[PDB]
Design a protein around this nucleic acid. Structure first.
Ligand SMILES: [Mg+2]
Ligand SMILES: [Mg+2]
Ligand SMILES: [Mg+2]
Ligand SMILES: [Mg+2]
Ligand SMILES: [Mg+2]
Ligand SMILES: [Mg+2]
Ligand SMILES: [Mg+2]
Ligand SMILES: [Mg+2]
Ligand SMILES: [Mg+2]
Ligand SMILES: [Mg+2]
Ligand SMILES: [Mg+2]
Ligand SMILES: [Mg+2]
Ligand SMILES: [Mg+2]
Ligand SMILES: [Mg+2]
Ligand SMILES: [Mg+2]
Ligand SMILES: [Mg+2]
Ligand SMILES: [Mg+2]
Ligand SMILES: [Mg+2]
Ligand SMILES: [Mg+2]
Ligand SMILES: [Mg+2]
Ligand SMILES: [Mg+2]
Ligand SMILES: [Mg+2]
Ligand SMILES: [Mg+2]
Ligand SMILES: [Mg+2]
Ligand SMILES: [Mg+2]
Ligand SMILES: [Mg+2]
Ligand SMILES: [Mg+2]
Ligand SMILES: [Mg+2]
Ligand SMILES: [Mg+2]
Ligand SMILES: [Mg+2]
Ligand SMILES: [Mg+2]
Ligand SMILES: [Mg+2]
Ligand SMILES: [Mg+2]
Ligand SMILES: [Mg+2]
Ligand SMILES: [Mg+2]
Ligand SMILES: [Mg+2]
Ligand SMILES: [Mg+2]
Ligand SMILES: [Zn+2]
Lengths: 136, 66, 116, 52, 76, 177
RNA sequence: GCGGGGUUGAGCAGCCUGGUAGCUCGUCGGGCUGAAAACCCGAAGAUCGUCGGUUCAAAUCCGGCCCCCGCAACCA
RNA sequence: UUCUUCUAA
RNA sequence: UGCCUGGCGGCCGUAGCGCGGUGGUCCCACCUGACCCCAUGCCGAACUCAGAAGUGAAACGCCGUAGCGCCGAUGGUAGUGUGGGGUCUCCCCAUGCGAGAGUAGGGAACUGCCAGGCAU
RNA sequence: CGUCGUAGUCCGGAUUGGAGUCUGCAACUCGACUCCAUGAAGUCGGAAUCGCUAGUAAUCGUGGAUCAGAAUGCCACGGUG
RNA sequence: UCCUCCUAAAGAGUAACGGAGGAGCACGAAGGUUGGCUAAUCCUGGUCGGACAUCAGGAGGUUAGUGCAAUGGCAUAAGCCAGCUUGACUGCGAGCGUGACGGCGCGAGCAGGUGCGAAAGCAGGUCAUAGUGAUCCGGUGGUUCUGAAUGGAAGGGCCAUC
RNA sequence: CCGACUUACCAACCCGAUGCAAACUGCGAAUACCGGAGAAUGUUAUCACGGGAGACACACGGCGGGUGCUAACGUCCGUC
């Protein structure tokens, strides 16, 4: 599970998640899994989809994870009234805008990358798509 | 330099066993008799001999004859 | 190095006289020559100037970089300033010690008629 | 709050006084300053006395 | 919990903007540091408060090699 | 200034030939000699510092500048500001006369002297050496002292490269090897 | 939920406003004894619960945690 | 003054 | 008037670094000497003084150079005031404003007053 | 008789290096001795404990057995006492 | 109760049992002024000396420093040394800031007297913002202002202060 | 003692590429706010002083947010 080792602060405001993304082009590898929808990927959802694509390539090739869950998410416990401080940090998410490349991959054929990213996208809440390295 | 804080610094004569009379400015006050100077120190002849490794075969052949 | 540290040593009193609106006399000291000039409060133009690099002053002197030459500059720059009607100035030592040739110039300028 | 407070009595004969504080632990010797005395209108040496 | 505190708002900022005629002694900027600097006919207070030493219009300008912001009172 | 006189006539003629400098100001020259005694044991008492500064004032005839800690470190149990050493800078005539007494008297008086290192020129010509024992200078009386100090000598020169300072001291027959 | 504690093998001091690790029993080595106890002599050992921070420097100060011991979890 | 105990045939 | 230099500004990196080159009649720099004026929590290093033997090595100035720093459109994109709309955690339409980053490109400053030197 | 003059010493001799002699087919493991150099610990010993009643203890040398060589052990011997 | 940052939506202000930290002092120099100076870290070399003392060179360019929290400042340094000193002055204060108010804050200049500086000048505490408590009652010093027939006195007032 | 080397091991700095930030900023809007000038318009709409109040339990909706679960006809602010 991805998680920051140190943090400058323990808790963070909820914020908003509007706007387009920045990691748009396939930077490192040859094939990419691009987010189309909007939302947040938890640290469990990122690591479960990595396992689902690592097994589909039989650890052949190299897999990048472009995102990282760095936003702490608090929850209040069950049967606790709405006052008395902010809740405890429970898990970590990464805010995902449309256009964000979520994963990259090379060292595999194209058809193997389609079937690997399709098995990975079934673990992710947001709607994704398949992209390739564009020249320029 | 300042006036009072420094020690007395006076020119004296330093002679050695090789007779190298040399006048230096110093804080000794009385006259000085040396033992080795840079002229007569065995750094340029004596220290070359003072390695003295020696041969093991040469030690063997010296002790007798076949 | 020595040139740069002299400017930092001078740039506080120069900015202080810059906001006082003071017509200010600038001394500049080299090992061979010594310079003087009175600068307008805008800081962009001068009024009078004197030196041991000028022929009319240096030929009356023994060496251009001693205290007697430095007193001759401060006397000369004051007599040119009072000719043009400049009477009240403020002495900018320009990062030197107020001592020796710098002091001998300013003591000559006070005595010859400038007012600071 | 170890820094106690004192008063500086004028030595000009007037009972005028400035009041101030000092650390009596680290400065056992008495404080003496030359201050302005508005009654005599001169600068006169004041000496430390107890605030009482 | 542990986070109930805060201090009172010290109401800093710029009290008179540019091109705005003031009397002598009028506070122009209250600020912590010298975020602004005193130019012509402008004094700097004890707590780095910039007040006008004369009467006239406020002029904001950037001078110097460090590109610091100077406040001056133009004559009027 | 005997070696200073020896510098100006024969050392300068020597180095200008074997380096082909354009100007005579381009030649190296020695600038200052610094005599440090790091006395880290003076935190116990000032008298060890007060007598080691007295000893180094006898070696080079100047009152030493008592140096202090630049910052505080706990591995040595010192705080920023404790008097922790003494130095003497030697320039001018007093530089040369100590430099005369060093390479002629005190360096032969080293016990088991067998040379110096040519690997002590700090990448930029400045040479630094360290002596084990203050008795090699004849200024110290052997009966009057009790404690073996040590100091280190640092010759700061104007040589740009590393070898140009090595050639400079060799013109003064500095006993490298 | 709130307090207190965590220190040689064991049980406890010192934890004090940060520069400095103690006792008892146990353990080791002798001695005495026919031999084992008791006794006598001489010994030694601690990363001070963890994890961050403050500091020149933390067993110590601060924060978070873990374990343990207390206290309270009431009114319908 | 106190001063205990020792299996195997 | 030209060239070169010194001083004081304006301006505040298109003005800064780097790299290569170059300057000593004057100027400047290093430099020579220091009992003194003065100075070193030691040291004539600095500061200061008396000077002018040497050198432009360093420094400084100047010239060249796109390794940088810096500057930087146009178009687009983000945002957003008002009005309207939708599938309303976020977007769209009309209209007004319009970045940042990046791209093309620019770029080895410009200028005032005075003084000195050498020429004209 | 001279010398050291209270010190780790002109006390103490370990250790180690170099050079040797002799024994013995043969001295590396693993001999003894010599020479030159080296100069540890040790400044009278905790609890405890041993021997000894007169030529005794204490101390000082001497010899033998075994044995090519190889004792501070063992067995004898006298001196001082 | 008070200070600093965020929330706070680019003036001010802005709530929650919202997110994070501090204060209830210190300083007779850690104030004033004049003069001077410029860091952290790393690299190499060097007696003891070692990851780390001090010394000499170089890179670096404030990543340091600020009596203490945070933020904003700071090279003309507000950072760091030394000399002389008490302006940590008294009476005032145009004009503004900030509050419902009590209050709090900034302030050129003026009068007196002073310190430093050759001089221009600077100084009415400290880089700034925390380090605090109304009124009553009472204490102390000063002051003929008042003094219950009158002269005093007591007591009160005013000024300083607890 | 010095090490010798190699190894499906980790890794500072630095370099290149790539993200993120309420308490990051070498950048930086729209609006808002302050000041000036000018018309047109508005029953002075503005300010000062005085007489009398009421009110200090707000609600939902839009937008910008904290909190909550971007849960609530929830809660707490800004603005309409
Ligand atoms: Mg937002
Ligand atoms: Mg027993
Ligand atoms: Mg401890
Ligand atoms: Mg039993
Ligand atoms: Mg160059
Ligand atoms: Mg000089
Ligand atoms: Mg050159
Ligand atoms: Mg555009
Ligand atoms: Mg742009
Ligand atoms: Mg350029
Ligand atoms: Mg250039
Ligand atoms: Mg004898
Ligand atoms: Mg002996
Ligand atoms: Mg011993
Ligand atoms: Mg003895
Ligand atoms: Mg018997
Ligand atoms: Mg035998
Ligand atoms: Mg605001
Ligand atoms: Mg706003
Ligand atoms: Mg201070
Ligand atoms: Mg200063
Ligand atoms: Mg100060
Ligand atoms: Mg402060
Ligand atoms: Mg009451
Ligand atoms: Mg009466
Ligand atoms: Mg009366
Ligand atoms: Mg009466
Ligand atoms: Mg932000
Ligand atoms: Mg109410
Ligand atoms: Mg209400
Ligand atoms: Mg309400
Ligand atoms: Mg409301
Ligand atoms: Mg809302
Ligand atoms: Mg809400
Ligand atoms: Mg509601
Ligand atoms: Mg709601
Ligand atoms: Mg609302
Ligand atoms: Zn000799």
């Amino acid at each position: 599970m991805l998680q920051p080792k140190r943090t400058k602060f323990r808790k963070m405001h909820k914020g908003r998640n509007r706007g387009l993304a920045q990691g748009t082009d396939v930077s490192f590898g040859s094939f990419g899994l691009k987010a189309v929808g909007r939302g947040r990927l938890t640290a469990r959802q990122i690591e479960a989809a990595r396992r689902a694509m690592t097994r589909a390539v039989k650890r052949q090739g190299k897999i990048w994870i472009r995102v990282f869950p760095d936003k702490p998410i608090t929850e209040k416990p069950l049967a606790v009234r709405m006052g008395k401080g902010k809740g405890n940090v429970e898990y970590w998410v990464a805010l995902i805008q449309p256009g964000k490349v979520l994963y990259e991959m090379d060292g595999v054929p194209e058809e193997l990358a389609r079937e690997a990213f399709k098995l990975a996208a079934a673990k992710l809440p947001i709607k994704t798509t398949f992209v390739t390295k564009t020249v320029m | 330099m300042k006036k009072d804080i420094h020690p007395k610094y006076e020119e004296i004569t330093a002679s050695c066993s090789c007779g190298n009379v040399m006048k230096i400015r110093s804080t000794v006050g009385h006259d000085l008799n040396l033992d080795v100077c840079s002229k007569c120190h065995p750094f340029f002849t004596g220290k070359q001999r003072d390695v003295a490794t020696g041969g093991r075969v040469d030690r063997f052949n010296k002790r007798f004859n076949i | 190095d020595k040139k740069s540290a002299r400017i930092r040593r001078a740039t506080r009193a120069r900015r202080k006289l810059q906001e006082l609106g003071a017509t200010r006399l600038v001394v500049h000291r080299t090992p061979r020559h010594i310079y003087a000039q009175v600068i307008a409060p805008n800081g962009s133009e001068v009024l009078v100037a004197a030196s041991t690099v000028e022929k009319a002053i240096a030929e009356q002197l023994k060496y251009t970089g001693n205290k007697d030459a430095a007193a001759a500059v401060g006397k000369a720059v004051a007599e040119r300033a009072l000719e043009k009607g400049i009477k009240d100035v403020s002495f900018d030592r320009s990062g030197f010690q107020y001592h020796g040739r710098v002091q001998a110039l300013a003591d000559a300028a006070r005595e010859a008629g400038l007012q600071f | 709050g170890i820094r106690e407070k004192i008063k500086l009595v004028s030595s000009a004969g007037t009972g005028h006084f400035y009041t101030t504080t000092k650390n009596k632990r680290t400065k056992p010797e008495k404080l003496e300053l030359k201050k302005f005395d508005p009654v005599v209108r001169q600068h006169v040496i004041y000496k430390e006395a107890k605030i009482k | 919990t542990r986070n109930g505190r805060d201090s009172e708002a010290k109401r800093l900022g710029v009290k008179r903007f540019g091109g705005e005629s003031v009397l002598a002694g009028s506070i122009i900027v209250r600020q912590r540091g010298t975020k602004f600097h005193a130019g012509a006919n402008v004094g700097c207070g004890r707590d780095h408060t910039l007040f006008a030493k004369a009467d006239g219009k406020v002029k904001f300008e950037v001078k110097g090699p460090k590109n610091r912001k100077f406040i001056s009172i133009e004559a009027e | 200034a005997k070696l200073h006189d020896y510098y100006k006539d024969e050392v300068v003629k020597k180095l200008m030939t074997e380096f082909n400098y354009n100007s005579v100001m381009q030649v190296p020259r020695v600038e200052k000699i610094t005599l440090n005694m790091g006395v880290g044991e003076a935190i116990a008492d000032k008298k060890l510092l007060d007598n080691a500064a007295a000893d180094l004032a006898a070696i080079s005839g100047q009152k030493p500048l008592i140096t202090k800690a630049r910052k505080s470190v706990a591995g040595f149990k010192i705080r920023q500001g404790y008097p922790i050493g003494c130095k003497v800078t030697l320039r001018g005539e007093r530089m040369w006369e100590f430099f005369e007494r060093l390479i002629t008297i005190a360096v032969p008086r080293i016990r088991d002297f067998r040379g110096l290192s040519a690997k002590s020129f700090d990448g930029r010509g400045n040479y630094s050496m360290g002596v084990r024992e203050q008795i090699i200078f004849p200024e110290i009386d052997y009966d009057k002292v009790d404690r073996v100090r040590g100091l280190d000598i640092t010759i700061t020169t104007t040589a740009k490269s590393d070898e140009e300072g090595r050639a400079l001291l060799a013109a003064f027959d500095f006993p490298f090897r």
